[PDB]
Coordinates of C-alpha atoms and ligand atoms in Angstrom, one line a residue:
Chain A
X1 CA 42.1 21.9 16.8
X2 CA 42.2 18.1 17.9
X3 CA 38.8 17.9 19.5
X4 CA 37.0 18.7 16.3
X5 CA 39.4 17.2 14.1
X6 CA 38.5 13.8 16.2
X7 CA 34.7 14.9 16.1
X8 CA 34.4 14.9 12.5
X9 CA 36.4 11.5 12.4
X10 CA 34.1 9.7 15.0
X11 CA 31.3 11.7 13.1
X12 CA 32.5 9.9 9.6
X13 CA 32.9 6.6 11.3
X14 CA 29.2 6.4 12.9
X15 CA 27.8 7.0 9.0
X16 CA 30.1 4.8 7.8
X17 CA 28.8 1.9 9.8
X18 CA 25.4 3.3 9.5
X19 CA 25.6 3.7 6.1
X20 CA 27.7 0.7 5.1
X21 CA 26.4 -2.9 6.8
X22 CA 29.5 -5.0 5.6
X23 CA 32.3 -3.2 7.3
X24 CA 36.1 -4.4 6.7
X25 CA 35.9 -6.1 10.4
X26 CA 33.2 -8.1 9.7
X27 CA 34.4 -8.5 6.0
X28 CA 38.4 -9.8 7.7
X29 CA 36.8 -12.0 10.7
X30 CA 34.9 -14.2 7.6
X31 CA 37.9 -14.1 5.5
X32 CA 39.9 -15.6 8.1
X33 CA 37.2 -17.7 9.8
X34 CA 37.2 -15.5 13.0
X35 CA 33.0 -16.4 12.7
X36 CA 28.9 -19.4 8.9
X37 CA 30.7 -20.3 6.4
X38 CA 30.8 -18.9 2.8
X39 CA 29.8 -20.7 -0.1
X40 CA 33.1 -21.2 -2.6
X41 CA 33.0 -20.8 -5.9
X42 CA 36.2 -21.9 -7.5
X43 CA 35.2 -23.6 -11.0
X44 CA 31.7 -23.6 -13.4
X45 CA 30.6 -26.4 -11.6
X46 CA 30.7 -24.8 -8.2
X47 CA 29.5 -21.6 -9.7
X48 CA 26.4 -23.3 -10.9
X49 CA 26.1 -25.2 -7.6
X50 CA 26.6 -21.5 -6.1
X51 CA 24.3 -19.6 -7.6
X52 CA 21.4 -22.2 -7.0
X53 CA 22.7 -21.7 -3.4
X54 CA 22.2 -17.9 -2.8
X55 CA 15.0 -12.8 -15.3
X56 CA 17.5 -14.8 -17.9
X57 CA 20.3 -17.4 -18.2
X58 CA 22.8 -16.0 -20.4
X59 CA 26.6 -17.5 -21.0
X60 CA 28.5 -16.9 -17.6
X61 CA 31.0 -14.7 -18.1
X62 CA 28.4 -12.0 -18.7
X63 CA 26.0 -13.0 -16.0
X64 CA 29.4 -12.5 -13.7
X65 CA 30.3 -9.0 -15.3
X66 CA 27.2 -8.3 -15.1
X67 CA 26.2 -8.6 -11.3
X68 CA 29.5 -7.0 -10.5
X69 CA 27.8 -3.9 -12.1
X70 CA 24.3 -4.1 -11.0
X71 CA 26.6 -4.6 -7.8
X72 CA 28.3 -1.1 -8.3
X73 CA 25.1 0.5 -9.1
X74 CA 23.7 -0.5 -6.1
X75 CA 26.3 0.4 -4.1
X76 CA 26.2 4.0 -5.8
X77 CA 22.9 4.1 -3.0
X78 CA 24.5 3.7 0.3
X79 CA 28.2 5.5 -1.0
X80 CA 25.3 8.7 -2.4
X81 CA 23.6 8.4 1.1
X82 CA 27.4 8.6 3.3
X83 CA 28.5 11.8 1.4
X84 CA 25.6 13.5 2.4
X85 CA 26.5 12.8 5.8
X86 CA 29.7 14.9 5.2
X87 CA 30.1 18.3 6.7
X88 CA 29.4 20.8 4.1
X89 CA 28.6 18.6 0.9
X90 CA 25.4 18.7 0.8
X91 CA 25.8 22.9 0.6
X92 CA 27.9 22.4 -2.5
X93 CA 26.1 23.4 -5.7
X94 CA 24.2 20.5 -7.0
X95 CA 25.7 20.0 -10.3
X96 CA 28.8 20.0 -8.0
X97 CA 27.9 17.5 -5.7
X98 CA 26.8 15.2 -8.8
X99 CA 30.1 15.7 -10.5
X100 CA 32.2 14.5 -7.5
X101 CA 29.6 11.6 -6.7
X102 CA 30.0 10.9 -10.6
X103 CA 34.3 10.6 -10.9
X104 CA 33.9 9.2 -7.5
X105 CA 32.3 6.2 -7.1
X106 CA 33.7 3.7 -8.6
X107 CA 37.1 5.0 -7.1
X108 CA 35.0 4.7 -3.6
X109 CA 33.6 0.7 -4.4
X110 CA 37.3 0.0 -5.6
X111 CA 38.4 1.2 -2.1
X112 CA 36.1 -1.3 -0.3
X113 CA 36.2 -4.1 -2.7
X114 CA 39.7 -4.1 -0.9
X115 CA 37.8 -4.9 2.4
X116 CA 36.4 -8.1 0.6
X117 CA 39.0 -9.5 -0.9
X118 CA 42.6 -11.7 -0.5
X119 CA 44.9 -12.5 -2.9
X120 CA 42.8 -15.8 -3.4
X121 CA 39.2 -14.8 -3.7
X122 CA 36.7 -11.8 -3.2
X123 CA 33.7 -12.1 -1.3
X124 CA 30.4 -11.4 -2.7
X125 CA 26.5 -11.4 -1.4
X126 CA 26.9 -9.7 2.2
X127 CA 29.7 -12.3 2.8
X128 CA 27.7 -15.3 1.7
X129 CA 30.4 -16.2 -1.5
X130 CA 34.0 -16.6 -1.9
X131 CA 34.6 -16.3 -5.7
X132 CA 37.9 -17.2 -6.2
X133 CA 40.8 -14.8 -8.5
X134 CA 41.8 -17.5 -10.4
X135 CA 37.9 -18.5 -11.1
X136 CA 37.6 -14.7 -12.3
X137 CA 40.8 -15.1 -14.5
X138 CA 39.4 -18.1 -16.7
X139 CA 36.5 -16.5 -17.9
X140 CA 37.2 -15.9 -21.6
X141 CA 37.9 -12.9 -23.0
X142 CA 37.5 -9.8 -22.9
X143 CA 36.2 -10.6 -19.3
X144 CA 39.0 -13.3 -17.7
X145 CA 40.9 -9.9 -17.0
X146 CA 38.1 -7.5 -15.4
X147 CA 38.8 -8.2 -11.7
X148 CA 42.7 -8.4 -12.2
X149 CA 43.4 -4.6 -11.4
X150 CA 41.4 -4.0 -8.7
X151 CA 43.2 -7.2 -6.7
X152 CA 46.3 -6.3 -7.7
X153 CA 45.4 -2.9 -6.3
X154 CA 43.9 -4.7 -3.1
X155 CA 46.7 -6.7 -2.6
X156 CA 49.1 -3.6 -2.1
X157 CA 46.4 -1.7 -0.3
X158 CA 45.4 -4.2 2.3
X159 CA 49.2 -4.5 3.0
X160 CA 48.5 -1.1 4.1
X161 CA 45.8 -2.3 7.2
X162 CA 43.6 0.4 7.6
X163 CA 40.6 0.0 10.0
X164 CA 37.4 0.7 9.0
X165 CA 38.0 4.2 11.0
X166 CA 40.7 5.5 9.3
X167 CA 38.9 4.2 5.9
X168 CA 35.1 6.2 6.8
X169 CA 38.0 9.2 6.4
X170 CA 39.7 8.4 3.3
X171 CA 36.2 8.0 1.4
X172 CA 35.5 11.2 2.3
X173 CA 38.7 12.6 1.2
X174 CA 38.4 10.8 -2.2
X175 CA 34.8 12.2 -2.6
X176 CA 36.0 15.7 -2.3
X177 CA 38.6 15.9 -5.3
X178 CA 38.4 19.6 -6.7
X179 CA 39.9 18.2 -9.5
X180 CA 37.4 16.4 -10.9
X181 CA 36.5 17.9 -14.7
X182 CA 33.8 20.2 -15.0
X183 CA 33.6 21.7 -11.2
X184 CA 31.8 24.9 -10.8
X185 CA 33.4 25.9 -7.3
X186 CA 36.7 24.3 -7.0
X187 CA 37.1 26.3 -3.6
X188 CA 34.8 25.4 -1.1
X189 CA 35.8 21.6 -2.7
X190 CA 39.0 22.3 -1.3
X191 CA 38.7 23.9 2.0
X192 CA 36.4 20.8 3.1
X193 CA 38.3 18.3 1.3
X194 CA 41.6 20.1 3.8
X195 CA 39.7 19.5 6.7
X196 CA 39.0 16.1 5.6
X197 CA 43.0 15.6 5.2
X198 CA 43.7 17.3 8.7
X199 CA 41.5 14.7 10.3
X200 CA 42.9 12.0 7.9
X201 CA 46.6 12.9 9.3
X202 CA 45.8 13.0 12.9
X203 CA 43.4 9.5 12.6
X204 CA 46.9 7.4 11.0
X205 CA 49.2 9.1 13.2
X206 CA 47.0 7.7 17.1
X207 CA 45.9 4.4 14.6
X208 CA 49.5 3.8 13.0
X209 CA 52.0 5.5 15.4
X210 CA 54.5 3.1 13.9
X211 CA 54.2 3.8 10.7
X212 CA 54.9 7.3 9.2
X213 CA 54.4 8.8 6.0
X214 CA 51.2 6.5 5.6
X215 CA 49.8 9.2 5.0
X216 CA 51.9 9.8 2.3
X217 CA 51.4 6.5 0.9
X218 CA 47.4 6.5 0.9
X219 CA 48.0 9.6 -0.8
X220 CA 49.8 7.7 -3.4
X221 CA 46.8 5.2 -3.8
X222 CA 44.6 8.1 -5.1
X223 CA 46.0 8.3 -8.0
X224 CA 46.3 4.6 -8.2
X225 CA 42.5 4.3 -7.8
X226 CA 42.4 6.4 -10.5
X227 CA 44.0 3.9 -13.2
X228 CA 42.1 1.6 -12.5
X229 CA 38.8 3.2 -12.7
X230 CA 40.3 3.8 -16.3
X231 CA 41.1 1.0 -17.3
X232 CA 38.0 -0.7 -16.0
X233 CA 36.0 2.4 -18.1
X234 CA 37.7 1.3 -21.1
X235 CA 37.1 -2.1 -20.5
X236 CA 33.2 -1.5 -20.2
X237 CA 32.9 1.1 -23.9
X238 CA 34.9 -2.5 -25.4
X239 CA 32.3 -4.9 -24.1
X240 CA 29.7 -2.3 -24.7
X241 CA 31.0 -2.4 -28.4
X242 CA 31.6 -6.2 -28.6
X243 CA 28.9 -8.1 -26.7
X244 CA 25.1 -7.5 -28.1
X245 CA 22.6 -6.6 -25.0
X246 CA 23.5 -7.0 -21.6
X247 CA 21.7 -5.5 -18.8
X248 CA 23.8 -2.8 -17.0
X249 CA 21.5 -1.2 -14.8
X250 CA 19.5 -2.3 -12.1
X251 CA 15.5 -1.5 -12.2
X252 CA 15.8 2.0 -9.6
X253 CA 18.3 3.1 -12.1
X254 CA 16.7 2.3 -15.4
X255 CA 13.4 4.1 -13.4
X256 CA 15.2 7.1 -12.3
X257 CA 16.9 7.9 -15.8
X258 CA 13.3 6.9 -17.7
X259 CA 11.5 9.7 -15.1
X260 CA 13.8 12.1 -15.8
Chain B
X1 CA -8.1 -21.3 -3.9
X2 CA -8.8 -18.6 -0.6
X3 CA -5.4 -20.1 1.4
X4 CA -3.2 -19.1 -1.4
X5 CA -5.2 -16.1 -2.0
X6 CA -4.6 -14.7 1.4
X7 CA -1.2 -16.0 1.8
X8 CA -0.3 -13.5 -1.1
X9 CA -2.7 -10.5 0.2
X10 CA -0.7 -11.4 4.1
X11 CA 2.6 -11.5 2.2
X12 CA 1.8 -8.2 0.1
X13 CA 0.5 -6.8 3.4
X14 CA 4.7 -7.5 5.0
X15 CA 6.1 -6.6 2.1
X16 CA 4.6 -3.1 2.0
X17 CA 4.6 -2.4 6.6
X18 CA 8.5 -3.2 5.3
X19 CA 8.5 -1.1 2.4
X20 CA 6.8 2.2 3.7
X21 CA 7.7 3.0 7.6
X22 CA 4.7 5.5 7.5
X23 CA 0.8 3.6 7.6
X24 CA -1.9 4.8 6.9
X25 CA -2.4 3.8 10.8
X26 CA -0.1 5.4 11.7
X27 CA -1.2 8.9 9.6
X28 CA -4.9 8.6 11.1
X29 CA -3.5 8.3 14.3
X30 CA -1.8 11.5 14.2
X31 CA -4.3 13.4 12.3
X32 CA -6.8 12.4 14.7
X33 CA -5.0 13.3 18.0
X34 CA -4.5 9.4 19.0
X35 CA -0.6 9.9 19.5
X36 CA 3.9 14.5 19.2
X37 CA 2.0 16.6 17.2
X38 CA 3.0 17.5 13.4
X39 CA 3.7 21.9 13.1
X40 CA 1.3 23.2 11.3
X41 CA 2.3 24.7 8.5
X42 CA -0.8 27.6 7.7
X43 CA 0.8 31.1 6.2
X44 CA 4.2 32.0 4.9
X45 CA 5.0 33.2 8.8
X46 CA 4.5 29.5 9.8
X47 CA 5.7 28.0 6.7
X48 CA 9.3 29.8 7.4
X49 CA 8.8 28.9 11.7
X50 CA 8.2 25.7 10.4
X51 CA 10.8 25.1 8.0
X52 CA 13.0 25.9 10.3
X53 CA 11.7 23.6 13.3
X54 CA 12.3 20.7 10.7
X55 CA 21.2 24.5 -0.4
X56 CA 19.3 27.6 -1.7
X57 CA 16.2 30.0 -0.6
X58 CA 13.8 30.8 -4.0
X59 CA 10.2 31.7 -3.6
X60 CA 8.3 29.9 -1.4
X61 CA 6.0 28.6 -4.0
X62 CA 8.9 26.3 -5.4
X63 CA 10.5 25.8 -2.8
X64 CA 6.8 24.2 -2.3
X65 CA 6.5 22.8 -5.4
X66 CA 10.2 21.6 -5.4
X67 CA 9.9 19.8 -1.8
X68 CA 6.8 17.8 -3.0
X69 CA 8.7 16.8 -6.4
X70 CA 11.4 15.7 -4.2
X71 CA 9.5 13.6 -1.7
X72 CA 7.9 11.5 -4.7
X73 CA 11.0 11.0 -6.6
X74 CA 12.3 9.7 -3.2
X75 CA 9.3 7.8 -2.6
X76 CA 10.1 5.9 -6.3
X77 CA 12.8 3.7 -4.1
X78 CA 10.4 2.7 -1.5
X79 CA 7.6 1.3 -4.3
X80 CA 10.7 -0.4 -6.7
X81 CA 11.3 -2.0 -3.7
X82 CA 7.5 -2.8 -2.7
X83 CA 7.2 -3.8 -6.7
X84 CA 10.1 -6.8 -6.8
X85 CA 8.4 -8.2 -3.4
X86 CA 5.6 -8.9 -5.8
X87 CA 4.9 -12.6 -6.9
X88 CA 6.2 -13.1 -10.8
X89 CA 6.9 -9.0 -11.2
X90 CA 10.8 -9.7 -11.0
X91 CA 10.4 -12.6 -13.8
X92 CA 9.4 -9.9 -16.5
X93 CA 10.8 -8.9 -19.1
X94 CA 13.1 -5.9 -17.4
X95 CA 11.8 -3.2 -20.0
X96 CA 8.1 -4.1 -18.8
X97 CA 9.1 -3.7 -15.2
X98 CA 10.5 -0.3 -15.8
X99 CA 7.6 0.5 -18.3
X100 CA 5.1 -0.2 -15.5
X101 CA 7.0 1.5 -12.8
X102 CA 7.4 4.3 -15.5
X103 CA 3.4 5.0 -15.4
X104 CA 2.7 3.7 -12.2
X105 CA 4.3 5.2 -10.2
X106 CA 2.8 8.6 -9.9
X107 CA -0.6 7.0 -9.2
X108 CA 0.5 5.3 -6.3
X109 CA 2.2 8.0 -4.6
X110 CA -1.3 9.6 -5.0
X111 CA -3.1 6.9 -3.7
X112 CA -0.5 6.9 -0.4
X113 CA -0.5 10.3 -0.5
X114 CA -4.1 10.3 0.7
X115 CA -3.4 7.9 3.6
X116 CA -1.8 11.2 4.7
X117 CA -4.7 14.1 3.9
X118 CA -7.8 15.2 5.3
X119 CA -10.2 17.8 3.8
X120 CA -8.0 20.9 5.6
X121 CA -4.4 19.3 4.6
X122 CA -1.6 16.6 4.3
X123 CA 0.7 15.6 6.8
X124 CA 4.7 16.1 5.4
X125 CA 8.4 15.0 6.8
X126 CA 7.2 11.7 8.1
X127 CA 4.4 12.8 10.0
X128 CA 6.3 16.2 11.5
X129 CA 4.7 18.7 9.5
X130 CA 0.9 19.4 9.0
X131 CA 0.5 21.9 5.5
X132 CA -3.1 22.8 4.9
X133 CA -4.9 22.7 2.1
X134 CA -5.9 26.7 1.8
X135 CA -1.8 27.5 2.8
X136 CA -1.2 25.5 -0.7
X137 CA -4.3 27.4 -2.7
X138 CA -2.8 30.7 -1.4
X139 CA -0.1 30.3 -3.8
X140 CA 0.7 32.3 -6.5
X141 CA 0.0 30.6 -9.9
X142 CA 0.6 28.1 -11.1
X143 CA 1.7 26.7 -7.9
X144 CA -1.9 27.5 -6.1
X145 CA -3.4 24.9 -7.9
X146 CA -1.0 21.9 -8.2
X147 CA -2.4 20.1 -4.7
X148 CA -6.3 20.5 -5.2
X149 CA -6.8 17.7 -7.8
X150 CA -5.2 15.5 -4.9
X151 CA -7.2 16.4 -2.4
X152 CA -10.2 16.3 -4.1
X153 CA -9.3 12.5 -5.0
X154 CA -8.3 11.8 -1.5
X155 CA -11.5 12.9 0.3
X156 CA -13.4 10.5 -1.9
X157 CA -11.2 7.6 -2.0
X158 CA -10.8 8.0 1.9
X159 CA -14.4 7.9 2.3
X160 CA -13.8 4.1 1.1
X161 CA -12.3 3.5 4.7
X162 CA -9.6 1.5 3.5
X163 CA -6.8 0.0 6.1
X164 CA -3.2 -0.3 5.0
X165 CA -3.8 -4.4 4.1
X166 CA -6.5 -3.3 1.5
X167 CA -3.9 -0.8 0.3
X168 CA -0.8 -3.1 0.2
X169 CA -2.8 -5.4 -3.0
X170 CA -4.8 -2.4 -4.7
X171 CA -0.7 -0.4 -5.3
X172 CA 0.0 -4.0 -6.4
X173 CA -3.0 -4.4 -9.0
X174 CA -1.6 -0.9 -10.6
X175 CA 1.7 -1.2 -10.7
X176 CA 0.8 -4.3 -12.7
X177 CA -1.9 -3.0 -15.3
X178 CA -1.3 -4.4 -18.6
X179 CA -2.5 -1.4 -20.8
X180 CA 0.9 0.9 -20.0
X181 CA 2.1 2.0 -23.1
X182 CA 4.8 0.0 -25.1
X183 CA 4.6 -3.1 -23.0
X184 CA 6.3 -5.7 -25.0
X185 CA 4.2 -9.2 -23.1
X186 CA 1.2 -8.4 -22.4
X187 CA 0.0 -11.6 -21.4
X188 CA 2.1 -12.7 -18.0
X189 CA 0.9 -9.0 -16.6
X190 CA -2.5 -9.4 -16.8
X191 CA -2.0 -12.8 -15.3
X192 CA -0.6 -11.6 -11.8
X193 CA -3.2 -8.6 -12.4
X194 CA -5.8 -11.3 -12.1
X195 CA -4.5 -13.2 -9.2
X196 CA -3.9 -9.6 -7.8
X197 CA -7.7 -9.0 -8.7
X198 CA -9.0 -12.2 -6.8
X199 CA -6.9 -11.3 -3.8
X200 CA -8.7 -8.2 -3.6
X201 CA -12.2 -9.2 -4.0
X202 CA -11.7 -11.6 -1.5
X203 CA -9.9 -8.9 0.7
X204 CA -12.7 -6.6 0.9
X205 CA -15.1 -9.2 1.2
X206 CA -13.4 -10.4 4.6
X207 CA -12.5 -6.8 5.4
X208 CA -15.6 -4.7 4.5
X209 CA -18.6 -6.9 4.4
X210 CA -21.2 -4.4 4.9
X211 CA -19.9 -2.6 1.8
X212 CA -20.8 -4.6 -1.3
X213 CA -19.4 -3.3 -4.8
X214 CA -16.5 -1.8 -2.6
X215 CA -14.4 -3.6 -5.4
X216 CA -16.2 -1.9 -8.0
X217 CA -15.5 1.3 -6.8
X218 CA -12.1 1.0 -6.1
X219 CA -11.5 -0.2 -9.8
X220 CA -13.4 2.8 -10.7
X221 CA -10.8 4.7 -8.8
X222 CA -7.7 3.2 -11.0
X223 CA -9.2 5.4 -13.4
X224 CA -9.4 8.6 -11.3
X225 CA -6.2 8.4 -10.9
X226 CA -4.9 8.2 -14.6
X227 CA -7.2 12.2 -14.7
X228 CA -4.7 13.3 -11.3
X229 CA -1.3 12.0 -13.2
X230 CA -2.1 13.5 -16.8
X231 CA -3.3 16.6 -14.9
X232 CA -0.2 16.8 -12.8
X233 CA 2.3 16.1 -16.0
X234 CA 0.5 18.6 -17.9
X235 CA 1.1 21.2 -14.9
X236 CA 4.5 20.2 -14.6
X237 CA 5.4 21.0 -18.1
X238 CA 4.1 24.2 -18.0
X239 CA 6.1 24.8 -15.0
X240 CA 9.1 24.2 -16.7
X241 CA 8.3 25.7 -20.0
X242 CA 7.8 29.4 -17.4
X243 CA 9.9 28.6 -14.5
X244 CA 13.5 29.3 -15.3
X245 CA 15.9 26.4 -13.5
X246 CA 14.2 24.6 -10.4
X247 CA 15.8 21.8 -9.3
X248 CA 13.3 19.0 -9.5
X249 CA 15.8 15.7 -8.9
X250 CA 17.1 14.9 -5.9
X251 CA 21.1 13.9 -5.6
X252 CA 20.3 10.0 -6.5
X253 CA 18.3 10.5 -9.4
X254 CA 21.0 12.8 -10.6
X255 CA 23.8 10.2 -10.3
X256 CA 22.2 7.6 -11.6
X257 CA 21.0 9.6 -14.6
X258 CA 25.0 10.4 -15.0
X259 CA 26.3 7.4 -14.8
X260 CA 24.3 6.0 -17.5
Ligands
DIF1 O1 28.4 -9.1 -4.0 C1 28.7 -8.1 -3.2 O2 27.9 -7.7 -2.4 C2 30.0 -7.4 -3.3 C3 30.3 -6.5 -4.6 C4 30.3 -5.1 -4.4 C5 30.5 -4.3 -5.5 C6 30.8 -4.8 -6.7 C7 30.9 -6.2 -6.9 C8 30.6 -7.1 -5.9 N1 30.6 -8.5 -6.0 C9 30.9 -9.2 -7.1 C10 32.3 -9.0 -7.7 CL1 33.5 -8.1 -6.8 C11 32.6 -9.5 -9.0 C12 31.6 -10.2 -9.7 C13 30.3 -10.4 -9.2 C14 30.0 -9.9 -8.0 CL2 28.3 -10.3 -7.5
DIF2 O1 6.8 15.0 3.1 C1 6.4 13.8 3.0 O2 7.1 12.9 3.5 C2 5.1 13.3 2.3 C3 5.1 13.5 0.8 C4 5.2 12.4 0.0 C5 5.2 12.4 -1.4 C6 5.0 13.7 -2.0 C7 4.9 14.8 -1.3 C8 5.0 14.8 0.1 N1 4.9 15.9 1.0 C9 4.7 17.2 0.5 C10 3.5 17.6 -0.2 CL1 2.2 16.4 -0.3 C11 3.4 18.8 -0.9 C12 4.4 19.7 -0.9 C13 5.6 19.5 -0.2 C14 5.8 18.3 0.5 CL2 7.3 18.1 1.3
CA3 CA1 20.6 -22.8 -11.7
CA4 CA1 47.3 0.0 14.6
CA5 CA1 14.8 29.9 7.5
CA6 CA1 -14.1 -3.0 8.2

């Protein structure tokens, strides 16, 4: 029915703002100077001038990679936190509800990377940088490259204009993939997940009356999400293999893994 | 010098009302009737009322056993957090950070823990719950056992009469103790352990000037509290070694873990 079908949506939108402080709103209003300003870093010598302006030194292409993934791992906290808050997840088998939050993730921080970025720049710190694409793309290799999927992917999904409501939905959605390898209980993955998509369809059709089969076309940018997480996995196992000693992990996770 | 030495203990004392919603105020407050009231939580009839008025259903002892292992993994984020607000701690060596959180910190969730006990029980669920002591003995065994060492330590380090600003630089002086095992510099630990040292002194000089050698007995107590954490890890592998498949992770220690 409509009512609950609207419930859940206003009920994934409420944990989505309470879960995520930077929402696409307040992400767009900066971009566009609706708002202060952030802090551009467009070359070395504005990166340097940056990063004085918000443990080790170590050459700047992997201090960059690097806080992009401490970044991600991070954000692995509030993205955890926001699928509890769906209906039903957190009565999924454990090694269930690890497996989806595991293939998941990155395919989530992809998804609202979008929020942050134009097809100039990407902004980073809670809003306070504007790291610029072609900045990204002059790091040397294997690292110049790193950032180019997921704008290309942003640039195409923005297009799109999804709100942060109809977004708090499509998370969720994404999150409950039965399809993800080594699933227990593909079932009740399923039946939540079709709840999630009846909402999802209602949400685009009273947010985006003029545009049908959007649905159809976020659709398509699940699988799309999906390339790039792995390309971006590949990418990682080839630095991994070709760059001695970088820290990957921030401390909670190098605690959590050494208490285990 | 005594301004820089209080500035630290007043900006360790912020630092940790930030870090950890529930003071020991707070706790003696409500265990005292000054506040509401916490369930109380006495026999397995008002553990199951209880647990109710606040995945799976196994026998109530791990269920016990499991909740507690919970809360302190949880807890782990809150003293991380605490442990970077720490002057110099975020400059080490990221290996020593973990290493000291590593064996840390057990002993401070004990120490907090007692912040929340009296002689008959411990206040759980942020202050909701109210589980006493004998309900925990009644347990089967192993389980009947796994609390008492805590309490025993908490009714004589409570007897010290510390307040949370005492509190908020004796955690600090053991997260940084400079005899963990495998600490790779040594040196710039025991240095903040020493400013940490002369904050204290100071503290309790201010704080509890009728009680001369109160420093002295609280270092004793860094000690006690090595006996409660090698008492607790030897219980806990003898749990797992006769306890088939208890969950003792929650979701985020899981994912992280996995994603390494
Ligand atoms: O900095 C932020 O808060 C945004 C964010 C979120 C997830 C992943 C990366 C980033 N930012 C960011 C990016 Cl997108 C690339 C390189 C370095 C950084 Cl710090
Ligand atoms: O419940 C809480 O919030 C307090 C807390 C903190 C750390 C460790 C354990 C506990 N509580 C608690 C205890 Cl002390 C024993 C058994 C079961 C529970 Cl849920
Ligand atoms: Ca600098
Ligand atoms: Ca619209
Ligand atoms: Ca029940
Ligand atoms: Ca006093």
């Amino acid at each position: 029915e409509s009512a609950d079908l609207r419930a859940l949506a206003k009920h994934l939108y409420d944990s989505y703002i309470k879960s995520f402080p930077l929402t696409k709103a307040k992400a767009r209003a900066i971009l566009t100077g609706k708002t202060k300003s952030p802090f551009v870093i467009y070359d070395m010598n504005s990166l340097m001038m940056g990063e004085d302006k918000i443990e080790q030194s170590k050459e700047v292409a992997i201090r960059i990679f690097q806080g992009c993934q401490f970044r991600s791992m991070e954000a692995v906290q509030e993205i955890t936190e926001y699928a509890k808050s769906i209906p039903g997840f957190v009565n999924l088998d454990l090694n269930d509800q690890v497996t989806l939050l595991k293939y998941g993730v990155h395919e989530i921080i992809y998804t609202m990377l979008a929020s942050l970025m134009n097809k100039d720049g990407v902004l980073i710190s809670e809003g306070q940088g504007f790291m610029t694409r072609e900045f990204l793309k002059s790091l040397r290799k294997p690292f110049g490259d790193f950032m180019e999927p997921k704008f290309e992917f942003a640039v195409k999904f923005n297009a799109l204009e999804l709100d942060d409501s109809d977004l708090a939905i499509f998370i969720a959605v994404i999150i409950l993939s039965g399809d993800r390898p080594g699933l227990l209980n593909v079932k009740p993955i399923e039946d939540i997940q079709d709840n999630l998509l009846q909402a999802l369809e209602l949400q685009l059709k009273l947010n985006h009356p003029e545009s049908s089969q959007l649905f159809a076309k976020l659709l398509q940018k699940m699988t799309d999400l999906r390339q790039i997480v792995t390309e971006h996995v590949q990418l990682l196992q080839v630095i991994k293999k070709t760059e001695t000693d970088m820290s990957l992990h921030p401390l909670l996770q190098e605690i959590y893994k050494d208490l285990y």
